[PDB]
């Protein structure tokens, strides 16, 4: 319902899907010859099936194929400065695929739409829907467009005739924030006590020995640390 969604929103007012409390299969995403761009920051595409995150956001919009480059950490351009801003410490990844047969039509598809005009560069992960016109000249427009008074929003003009870089390319951004809940399949084996093992407790990897803890926890506390990021005690997630 994120990827084969019938309608994607425009890049100024893109749609957000919250993903939580499920098991994600990333084999079907990396193992597809449809996605032109599959480039991942902070994670590798191969080891995404063994990482387990608190929450996953899915951001969907349509840009032309020439500016899939701008959807990246620390890029500049129009879409990156005014429509869609990714932070420089971005974890998660952006993908794209060609959608000429669904979003471009004869006579031009004037539904998909982008902001060109804004006074300031956009904050990352804070995205606006406002429709007040832009005053580039000195005369106050007072909400009247005309000369030196531009509406800041206009369409892309998607033609099937134009080149590969001007075709509509559906961009779906995945973001991972690292009590983890969203992770792929692996055999959750039995606990092994009093032995030097390689634990993987809900993504908290490491090695050590596992005994019971006599110290009292509270129902909201997942794991325990004593000093300087050392994982002292843990709860099994089952």
């Amino acid at each position, epitope marked *: 319902e994120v990827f084969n969604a019938t*309608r994607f929103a425009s890049v100024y007012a893109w749609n957000r899907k919250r993903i939580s409390n499920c098991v994600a299969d990333y084999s079907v995403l990396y193992n597809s010859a449809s996605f032109s761009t599959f480039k991942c920051y902070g994670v590798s595409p191969t080891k995404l099936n063994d990482l387990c995150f608190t929450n996953v956001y899915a951001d969907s919009f349509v840009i032309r194929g020439d500016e899939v480059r701008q959807i990246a950490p620390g890029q500049t351009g129009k879409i990156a400065d005014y429509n869609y801003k990714l932070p420089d410490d971005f974890t998660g990844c952006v993908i794209a695929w060609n959608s000429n047969n669904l979003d471009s039509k004869v*006579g*031009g598809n*004037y*539904n998909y*739409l982008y902001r060109l005009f804004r006074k300031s560069n956009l904050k990352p992960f804070e995205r606006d829907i406002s*429709t*007040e*016109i832009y005053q580039a000249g000195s005369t*106050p*427009c*007072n*909400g*009247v*467009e*005309g*000369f030196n*008074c531009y*509406f800041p*929003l*206009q*369409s892309y003009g998607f033609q099937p005739t134009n080149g590969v870089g001007y075709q509509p390319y559906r961009v779906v951004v995945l973001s991972f924030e690292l009590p983890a809940t969203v992770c792929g399949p692996k055999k959750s084996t039995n606990l092994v006590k009093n032995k030097c093992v390689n634990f993987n407790f809900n993504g908290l990897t490491g090695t050590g020995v596992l005994t019971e803890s006599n110290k009292k926890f509270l129902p909201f506390q997942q794991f325990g640390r004593d000093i300087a990021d050392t994982t002292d005690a843990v709860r099994d997630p089952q």
Partner: antibody
Amino acid sequence: EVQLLESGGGVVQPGGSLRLSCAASGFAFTTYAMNWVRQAPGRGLEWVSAISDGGGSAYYADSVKGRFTISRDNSKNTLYLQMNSLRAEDTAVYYCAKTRGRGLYDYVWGSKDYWGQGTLVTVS
Amino acid sequence: DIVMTQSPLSLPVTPGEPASISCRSSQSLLHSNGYNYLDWYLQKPGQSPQLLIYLGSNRASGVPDRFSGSGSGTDFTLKISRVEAEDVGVYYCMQALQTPGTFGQGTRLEIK
């Protein structure tokens, strides 16, 4: 490039319904405002209805409050005007015409730069 | 509402001569932003009407330069410097302040 197409409007018995559909081809129909105009043969124009972006704000003229039903589809870029309780004085040239207005004080019922192609409704 | 008046209605003007067209308003159309809100139109016979001048002064799209509107407050005037056979039409006036969009009675320009 930009032009407006209409459909429907013809011979109709009074006191019933009719359909008129306005489809757009070359503009940003989400962002532009939209307006409705009646023109009788032999006297000039009369505004009847107007709508803002995304529905919500619908306005009616003095004789047509409740008589006319207005609706908007932002997906298929079509403008509708559902028709109720037709009268012989409603025999007029009905056509969709668009407005500039996108500013705060541009007043969606105001400056209408383009007008549509045109069709005649005969209530007889 | 706004009781509107276009006078005189039938205008026989020799081609090449200037023609002066007026529309009058009961209430002041000057808003708090200082701009004029009254719009000037032309209807060709059998062809859909056009916006000629918006807001009293400025270029509507495709309108030739010899069409010019004037006025402030209530007394506005539309002027053409040169009238030709393509300038035949019936001239209207519409406001944008109140709820009903009030039209003019129509100023028929005729060629002698």
